[PDB]
């Protein structure tokens, strides 16, 4: 039940 944080908005920006 964690909240979206700026790192989640950055880690998913360019990955895989």
């Amino acid at each position: 039940l964690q909240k979206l944080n700026s790192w989640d908005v950055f880690g998913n920006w360019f990955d895989l």
Epitope: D8, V9, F10, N12, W13, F14, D15
Partner: antibody, heavy 123, light 108 residues
Framework: QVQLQESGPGLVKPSETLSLTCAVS?????????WTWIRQPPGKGLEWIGN????????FYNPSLKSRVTISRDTSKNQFSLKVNSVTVADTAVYFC???????????????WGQGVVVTVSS | DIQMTQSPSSLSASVGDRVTITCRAS??????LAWYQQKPGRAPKLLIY???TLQSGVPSRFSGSGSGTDFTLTISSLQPEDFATYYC?????????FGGGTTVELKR
């Protein structure tokens, strides 16, 4: 530059599993956008269901529905899906799928939407 | 969790009037608020993000303001194609809740 289109059954039965899909063209699913599912009961306002990161794969849901919701993704087909299990009659609504644009460290807005899909839950 | 209220729930005004809608949260959300316009039976249209940052292609008469737990969407010189329902949205952390909505009439 981006166009979304819902697809799925417009009629399900109570307690069944609803399955909807949102095709995306003009951009990649695997990217920094957060693909979100919205719903609006007939004659009511908007209700943010959940979203999912194209690359992170993590999901976020509405706390009033996290038990019954499941968001997924399909990179090859440029699609992302939503599943609502154990549906009830009170879920009949228009289900939008939109692209929640994002910044480097700050979300932005849902700048591209689909026309929507009507789905009724009735016996 | 979060509770987003809009006010007035609906108002009527004539073309050429300066209109203003208010959207209040139940907790601080910095300058992360998004406004949307929805025509009847159609999908919403992203108007504003980041409190007052106007989305490309939106007319200049749309202006956002406020910070924290009290935001404002103002339309200078209201136009006919602006009569619709307007929603606000928290866009910083989950659950990105939408406001209750505000409908705009044409006073007659």
């Amino acid at each position: 530059q981006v166009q979304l289109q819902e697809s799925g059954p417009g009629l399900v039965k109570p307690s069944e599993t609803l399955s909807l899909t949102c095709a995306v063209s003009g951009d990649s699913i695997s990217s920094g956008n957060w693909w979100t599912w919205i719903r609006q009961p007939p004659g009511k306002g908007l209700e943010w269901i959940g979203n999912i990161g194209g690359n992170s794969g993590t999901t976020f849901y509405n706390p009033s529905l996290k038990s019954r919701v499941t968001i997924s993704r399909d990179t090859s087909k440029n699609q992302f899906s939503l599943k609502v299990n154990s549906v009830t009659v009170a879920d009949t609504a228009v289900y939008f799928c939109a692209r929640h644009s994002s910044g480097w460290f700050s979300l932005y807005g849902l700048d591209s939407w689909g026309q929507g899909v009507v789905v009724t839950v009735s016996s | 969790d979060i509770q987003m209220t809009q006010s007035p729930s609906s108002l009527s005004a004539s073309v050429g009037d300066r209109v203003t809608i208010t959207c209040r949260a139940s907790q601080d959300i910095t300058s992360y608020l998004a406004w949307y316009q929805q025509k009847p039976g159609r999908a919403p249209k992203l108007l504003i993000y980041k409190t007052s940052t106007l989305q490309s292609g939106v007319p200049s008469r749309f202006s956002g303001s406020g910070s924290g737990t009290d935001f404002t969407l103002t339309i200078s010189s209201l136009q006919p194609e602006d009569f619709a329902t307007y929603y606000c949205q928290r866009h910083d952390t989950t659950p990105l809740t939408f406001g209750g909505g505000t409908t705009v009439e044409l006073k007659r």
